[PDB]
Enzyme design. Structure first.
Site, PDB file in Angstrom:
ATOM      1  N   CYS A 128       0.938  -1.182   0.000  1.00  0.00           N
ATOM      2  CA  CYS A 128       0.000   0.000   0.000  1.00  0.00           C
ATOM      3  C   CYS A 128       0.964   1.216   0.000  1.00  0.00           C
ATOM      4  O   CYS A 128       1.525   1.567   1.012  1.00  0.00           O
ATOM      5  CB  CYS A 128      -0.856  -0.124   1.297  1.00  0.00           C
ATOM      6  SG  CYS A 128      -1.905   1.412   1.446  1.00  0.00           S
ATOM      7  N   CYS A 155      -0.137   4.010   2.468  1.00  0.00           N
ATOM      8  CA  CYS A 155      -0.174   3.774   3.942  1.00  0.00           C
ATOM      9  C   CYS A 155       0.204   2.371   4.307  1.00  0.00           C
ATOM     10  O   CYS A 155       1.406   2.080   4.547  1.00  0.00           O
ATOM     11  CB  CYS A 155      -1.516   4.236   4.610  1.00  0.00           C
ATOM     12  SG  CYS A 155      -2.911   3.506   3.877  1.00  0.00           S
ATOM     13  N   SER A 156      -0.750   1.512   4.577  1.00  0.00           N
ATOM     14  CA  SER A 156      -0.339   0.152   5.081  1.00  0.00           C
ATOM     15  C   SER A 156      -1.455  -0.823   4.906  1.00  0.00           C
ATOM     16  O   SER A 156      -1.455  -1.871   5.549  1.00  0.00           O
ATOM     17  CB  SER A 156       0.030   0.180   6.578  1.00  0.00           C
ATOM     18  OG  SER A 156      -1.136   0.790   7.287  1.00  0.00           O
ATOM     19  N   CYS A 157      -2.378  -0.472   4.039  1.00  0.00           N
ATOM     20  CA  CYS A 157      -3.581  -1.282   3.819  1.00  0.00           C
ATOM     21  C   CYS A 157      -3.144  -2.728   3.581  1.00  0.00           C
ATOM     22  O   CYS A 157      -2.259  -2.983   2.718  1.00  0.00           O
ATOM     23  CB  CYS A 157      -4.286  -0.713   2.575  1.00  0.00           C
ATOM     24  SG  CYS A 157      -4.727   1.006   3.185  1.00  0.00           S
TER      25      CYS A 157
HETATM   26 CO   LIG Z   1      -2.577   1.436   3.715  1.00  0.00          CO
END
Ligand SMILES: [Co+3]
Ligand SMILES: [Co+3]
Ligand SMILES: [Co+3]
Ligand SMILES: [Co+3]
Lengths: 151, 217, 120, 152, 217, 120, 151, 217, 120, 151, 119, 217
Positions: free
Chosen positions: L106, L109-111
């Protein structure tokens, strides 16, 4: 045009990377850890294992002055003014971290050829400074500069 | 419009000659010698080795002796008659095998076997290659378009004292009955550094951007 | 003012080469091909050609390459002492903590004068 | 008081986070060096008069035993003809280069340069210097003491 | 613990003595000489100058000869018998007047008249003082609490060659009939550098932080 | 290897001092007290003690201070040539373009050897 | 010409001031001290007492767009979209440290006038993005841009 | 061409008017009001106070009531009829005396008494002035060409809430018999900020560099 | 979707002014002209108008200037609570440790709401 | 060990890499190019394709406070205070470049959880500042602080 | 103001997000297999269409779901719902320096309809 | 000693509960749900897909429905009954083949697919991974010890909207007649992100350093 904008953007972003930036202004000895002391006293040619970014590797054509500088350094060694290890230590280490990465490769070779002449007293620094003036005057007066500039 | 480097080069060179440290003839002689150099002798050494097992043994054991057979005497070829001051007289030849593949750098500067190979490439002198190859050589070699099996030993050779290296790659498939000349033709400069492997039909280094000089040789 | 001898190296090396001109000058080598040796982290003030990345690592000597003054001495014009130089192979896993186990066999070979070496 | 100490610590910290456009430099080709940059990279480091700088609180600093011993070594080396002070200034304040010139302490530079003159004029090989440093660290480690810095 | 600087200092000192470059006695003698130094003679030179116009003219024209009157002989007081190697033998005394007020720096390093004034202050050696005084002296002086009428000439002396300076400030009001001892007592180190003026009842430099050493003299 | 004379300075300066030991060696001075001089921007590669902030400024000679080798010589062990040194007073406004008109009388005094000076 | 060179030099060397430059790349919580926590969470308008260099203070002529922005912000407040305290908090603090010093004064006022419209949902961000495209197309089609550009 | 700020200004302004938040007429009204403003009313307040001790008492105690006498009603003069949204309705006048001299900043932004004084100067809005004046006011004032005796209390007023300040300087020497008009003429904007003091003969702010706009008002 | 009341401030302030429109709403002031007060170092997350340079300093109240919501509430649209604001004079020496004793009498005056003040 | 010192040294000399460092101090609108306008107004989260160096990747143990922050942020969304897209926009973009890279990943989630309570007026900033005051007093008093600190 | 805190849960419970938006976008403008170029729409304040895609062309491989654009959802505006597409881009089309040796490498990511135009 | 983060976390949580925004129950239930999460169900989805071609086609076309077979219902497993607010309800399973190999990030972000995979790794959240994988994936993968033939298509999936991915790698050689349990055991978290491929005998992610927490879960 859109793509060139994208790539210029990605280049610009990098200059704004946040950091904790501590200017150093001759800190007292109590501010220098063993870690810092080892890093400040490192020889800067020793880069192996340092992290670095990707680049598209390029070739470069040689400047006339670069070929001349290389020959000058090797002829000074051939004729016993120095050995190449003396050159490496002056050129790649004694120049210090800032000039080591701020100036170009054969820039350092050339500065260091000037340096050996002065450090071993084959010329005085006055003679070097005076000769630079002479070269600039030869140029300004329309008299040419070796292979670089015709009269 | 001369640059600061052109001014200081002329100054240095005139002072050295004025002070009798080297002559204008010395400098011409050295530049003339440098102009002679190039990668062909080293390509020839590899071709000869692929054709003669005894000579390949000599390459691996004594690269200085082996270099004589392609006309590069590391002592007596250069104008000093004591090897060039910067590249010395201890060539080693690194033999690739099906389980070993070499690649070379000088992390401390740019040491390179000029007497048998000619000019070092710009990128080889770069801090970037000098930092990264030793520690991520598979990553760097992949950028040059080379990948090897994970079980193959990649050996990076860091030329940090008086030895200089050339890489003798494995002879590629599709070269049955080839002559020394056809074999030498595919051993490019990049193959001799170890960032490429010889391939039939490929006779020049992979094209890459060339940064132009303000005023060229 | 001091006078620099500009003929010394050419007298010694012409028609012989460098480092051939030092051959025999180191005497008996302390180590042999196949010995495992650890790189001592000697002070590196002002000059060294033994890269920091090697300090404290263990490797195997694969060749006694030549005899020469150490660069730490040759680069300051001191060539009275000559020592053996060794080519040492290190496993890349012993240099870089992150190196992948998938690349199990990868190595680095480089040259070190005898003064940096201790028996492993 | 403790709160004022936290206030001045905070002003010092926020200065580390001032925004900037930061361009790392990595051995550029000679085509990227202007006259302005040539002159700036070849400048002698000591020549700082007229450079912009901020108000700082000026302080005194007690002298360290090692600083007094360094100062006396550098002047005894000149008394006895190993160098003149001008040679010392040039090595100490210029040839160290910009990074060390501002990153290390004032008498750090005097001491490094005293070691430097011994090696550059061949009174001591670099090997002798490196070996002496090895031997001094062993002295400290062993409990035998090190002069007035460390009793046995 | 012991620092890298303490280990290097003992290494350089032991090597210099082993190689006969200076003696152990030389080093003890030099430290003993430095311990004698301080700001009292310079303050007495100023007080004597205020009390005797002919001695004041001798100070302004020939600071070296004048210094002998306060027991500091710039040639023969140091152990060398040729002045200290780093401070030389050319003291100049700069005389302030109601229209002229001097302050001293060494922008290139920290040159200071040690034989007659003693140790240079830490701040005097800082890159900050060295950058800023020559260009914004009235800003720097005001940080030290000194301001003067816009019409008074502030002259910054940059000690860049072999001369060292002390400032002979104007004698302040409120000292009618004072003795040499009373006058000298108000001429502090800071008054002799030029960052303070002498004031009756002020006999110490202005208090500022003292950064402590790990192992102090 | 070279030998350094370590007794030269002490022999010449003992009982006399530096720069007193160089008195008379510069011959006649090129300039006089009250002369207006401009500071030449001589090459400054490797070393100078004529600060960048003076170059190209004009000032007034107020004193012929002494004779000595130039530091650009002395700092490389070259004492054969001795020249006069001058104390020069500059108006602050001539050095710094932003200097306040309010502070019209302020000056800077520093020392410069003869090689940097030219008649204004 | 020599003096201009001297002053360009003194400007250039400042850029090479050495420093210990630590890029920060989302450090773990164990790397954040109370000192750092208070510094990163500071509001950036609070500058008083910070050290800074000399400058020759200047006046500046006002851009047409700066006057229009100032009026827009005051009119939004007159007509009850926000109070000036809400504006100061968004414009001088919420923008964050980088934009706070990287962008111009009235740049911030203008970006924050756009922000209030979106944050209080008087316009959607889509309508704002669409209107910027409209303004650019008005310009490109030779239709002019209010008082900045005639048709 | 047009700049990104010009594009975004038009966008914002057109959306606000489309969504009925303010009108085009409101915007014109506000710009027209701002164009009316300037430093003359505040110079007049100071001259009136120098000539009438009762009116000077009122300035010092209640600047809002005082300002009415020079036609600036902080509630009802601006188009809102509730004070301008950003400068509010609490003017204070700071009276200098022979032992007190004031200077004003807004360290948090650029808060300034626009209703009675007109537009804030560029440098007043600068981070540089906002950082330094609070902590080195005598240094910054000296750059503006102002110095005071060291025993005079310099008071910096930081306008960090709803009060806005003007400075009432002391009446200068050399103004005996002057009329209100003659006195008001020498009370410039800079006097009212406190970076200058009024002087007979000086009727404009000190000249300083003017940075030019790409496209001006 | 939430609805914002765009008339509330004009209804309350028109013909009165700000901060006049809050007069009386703070009740009895906690401090008086001439009290010495120290500035509490309250959490400053997201917003404050009480400058860090004042935290933990002691000054003297010289005026009760007006009643208003604190900016920490007004800037988030919360104006239900109103407090007294005080003009406080600090000695410069109590703010900046370097400040010169020669400038003995210099001061700084600024406004602080009651929530930050404690009896000194 | 010596190896620990070696890797510490490589990390330290990265802090001393030479650069041209231009501090930025509220430039006039005439110093802002399109390129720089776009770079200052970029959304900080959009980092794909930016140059970066190889780094050793590590795992990190979860802190109790990180797990508690994650659950708060998700429970606030479950119960309709925001949607995760509002959270991402506040957390990863509106914090601005300096905090975005200077503070830890869950530091931003926690700050943004405090932010949504204040920006949607569920809690005044005064209530949040007061609660922080009271929590610090709880810690200081010896009475404990939930699972972080027993009495 | 009053924030409705029950809106999302009322519409999504038992169904999920983005399933709760199914059918609200109406007819899709594009189809699987279409080549589309990504418009460089203004990105002030927020976007989830990465800068590195702008102006590139790629192939639609899936119509993944319907949802408000994040440029809307992130500011509480869910009235408009549009189709989202999964795009595949050739790496050489994104990064000028990508190796010719790795000729087949791609990147797949999702873009709502507003950024797409027929190539 | 408790950090500023711990103080703020308790402040936010006590204020949200006091204001009724979620309950103390809600927060305990969410943490209990997160504790149930981990990489076992995603590995079982891959092993079942390898053992049943109809289930594999269900995975590739409809990952949400397929996920039910391994006990993760993206709508009803989380406490909301409308999927987790941050990971949504649109899992896609990316099927590697002999010519196609996927890896996921992602960049914004960090999905990550928490409901079927568990906690995102620290390095997956790093700005370093997020910058470099999309542009130099073969460099990054090779740092993880994965290289693939230059002709295999490496496809990076950037999870930038509401879809989450897992990678269904190819089933490796050396697994003839293996059961579901044996196959699931080699499909680690790293295989499901795409930075590793499954290998007989390897049942744990590649060891790397673990940075410790001051107060761990
Ligand atoms: Co994310
Ligand atoms: Co090399
Ligand atoms: Co000095
Ligand atoms: Co303001």
């Amino acid at each position: 045009s859109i793509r060139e904008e994208v790539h210029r953007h990605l280049g610009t972003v990098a200059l704004m990377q946040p950091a904790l930036h501590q200017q150093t202004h001759a800190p007292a000895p109590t501010e220098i850890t063993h870690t810092l002391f080892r890093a400040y006293t490192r020889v800067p040619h020793d880069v192996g294992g340092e992290a670095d970014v990707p680049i598209e590797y390029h070739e470069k054509e040689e400047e006339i002055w670069e070929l001349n500088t290389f020959a000058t350094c090797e002829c000074l060694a051939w004729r016993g003014v120095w050995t190449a290890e003396e050159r490496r230590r002056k050129q790649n280490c004694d120049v210090g971290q800032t000039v080591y990465l701020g100036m170009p490769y054969y820039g350092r070779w050339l500065l260091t050829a000037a340096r050996i002449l002065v450090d071993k007293q084959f010329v005085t620094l006055t003679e070097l400074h005076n000769k630079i003036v002479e070269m600039r005057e030869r140029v300004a007066s329309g008299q040419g500069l070796g292979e670089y500039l015709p009269p | 419009e001369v640059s600061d480097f052109e001014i200081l080069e002329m100054a240095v060179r005139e002072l050295a000659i004025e002070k009798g440290l080297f002559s204008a003839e010395d400098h011409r002689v050295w530049k003339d010698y440098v102009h002679t150099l190039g990668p062909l002798p080293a390509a020839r050494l590899v071709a000869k080795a692929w054709l003669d097992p005894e000579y390949k043994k000599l390459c691996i054991e004594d690269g200085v002796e082996a270099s004589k057979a392609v006309g590069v005497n590391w002592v007596t070829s250069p104008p000093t008659q004591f090897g060039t001051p910067s590249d010395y007289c201890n060539l080693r030849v690194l033999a690739d095998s099906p389980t070993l593949k070499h690649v070379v750098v000088c992390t401390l500067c740019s040491c390179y076997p000029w007497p048998i190979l000619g000019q070092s490439p710009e990128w080889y002198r770069s801090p970037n290659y000098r930092r990264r190859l030793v520690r991520w050589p598979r990553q760097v070699l992949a950028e040059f378009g080379l990948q090897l099996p994970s079980e193959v030993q990649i050996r990076v050779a860091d030329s940090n004292q008086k030895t200089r290296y050339i890489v003798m790659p494995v002879r590629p498939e599709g070269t049955d009955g080839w002559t020394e000349d056809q074999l030498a033709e595919i051993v490019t400069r990049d193959c001799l550094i170890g960032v490429a492997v010889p391939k039939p039909g490929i006779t020049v280094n992979a094209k890459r951007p060339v940064l132009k000089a303000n005023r060229p040789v | 003012k001091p006078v620099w001898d500009r003929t010394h190296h050419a007298k010694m090396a012409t028609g012989i080469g460098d480092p051939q001109c030092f051959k025999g000058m180191a005497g008996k080598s302390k180590f042999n091909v196949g010995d495992r040796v650890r790189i001592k982290d000697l002070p590196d003030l002002f000059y060294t050609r033994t890269m920091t990345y090697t300090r404290g690592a263990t490797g195997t000597i694969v060749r006694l390459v030549y005899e020469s003054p150490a660069a730490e001495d040759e680069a300051f014009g001191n060539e009275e002492n000559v020592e053996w130089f060794y080519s040492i192979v290190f496993a890349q896993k012993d240099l870089w903590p992150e190196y992948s186990d998938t690349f199990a066999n990868d190595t680095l070979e480089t040259e070190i004068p005898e003064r940096y070496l201790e028996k492993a």
